[PDB]
Amino acid sequence: MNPPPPETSNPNKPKRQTNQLQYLLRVVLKTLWKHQFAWPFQQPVDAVKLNLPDYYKIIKTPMDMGTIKKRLENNYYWNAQECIQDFNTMFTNCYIYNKPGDDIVLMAEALEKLFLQKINELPTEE
Ligand SMILES: CCOC(=O)Nc1cc(-c2ccc(C)c(NS(C)(=O)=O)c2)nn2c(C)nnc12
């Protein structure tokens, strides 16, 4: 079975809309989402569909760009670090679960190289 997806809505969690979070949506997420290699990362890993009952035994902090997109569009975050951590969790989960050189790892590595380039240019808070 698949676990429930990560939280994307919680009225108890305090929220902000900042210029760094806007950059994460309008520059970072947009660039990565349109990459040719983005598609396996655009929704939670579907262990049922892939017949991978082991995935959620190994990966206990799942994350994906569909969840991140919802968090950004629905103003779930307080700060940019929360969102950057989600991206980093997504990449590291892929490297933990899969073998070096696997197609999915090469795809994640291409997205991560672009992510790092965009994050290096993160604007100062206004
Ligand atoms: C032991 C074999 O290892 C794997 O198959 N690994 C991985 C596979 C895929 C993957 C493939 C095909 C499809 C159709 C999907 N779609 S989805 C997002 O709905 O689940 C995902 N994503 N993936 C991610 C992220 N991280 N690892 C993997």
At residue 79, φ and ψ (nearest 5 deg) are -145, 170
The 3-state DSSP composition of the chain as helix, strand, coil percent (nearest 5) reads 55, 0, 45
Whose alpha carbon is nearest atom 4 of ligand 1? Answer: 98
- Domain spans, the chain: 18-122
Distance, CA of 3 to CA of 113 (rounded, Å): 29
Concatenated DSSP letters for 4-40? PPPP---TTS-----HHHHHIIIIIIHHHHTSTT-GG
Please identify, by atom number, the ligand 1 atom nearest to the C-alpha of residue 45.
20
Ligand 1: residues within 6 Å at CB? 40-41, 43, 45-46, 49-50, 52, 94, 97-98, 104
Q: Measure 116 CA to ligand 1 centroid, in angstroms.
A: 22
Distances, alpha carbon 125 to alpha carbons 10, 17, 21, 82, in Å: 25, 11, 9, 15
Report in angstroms the alpha-carbon separations of 50 from 27, 44, 46, 47: 31, 12, 6, 5
| Architecture label for domain 18-122 | Up-down Bundle (1.20)
User: Which of these, 88, 78, 79, lies nearest to 115 by C-alpha position?
Assistant: 88
- The three-class DSSP label of residue 83 is helix
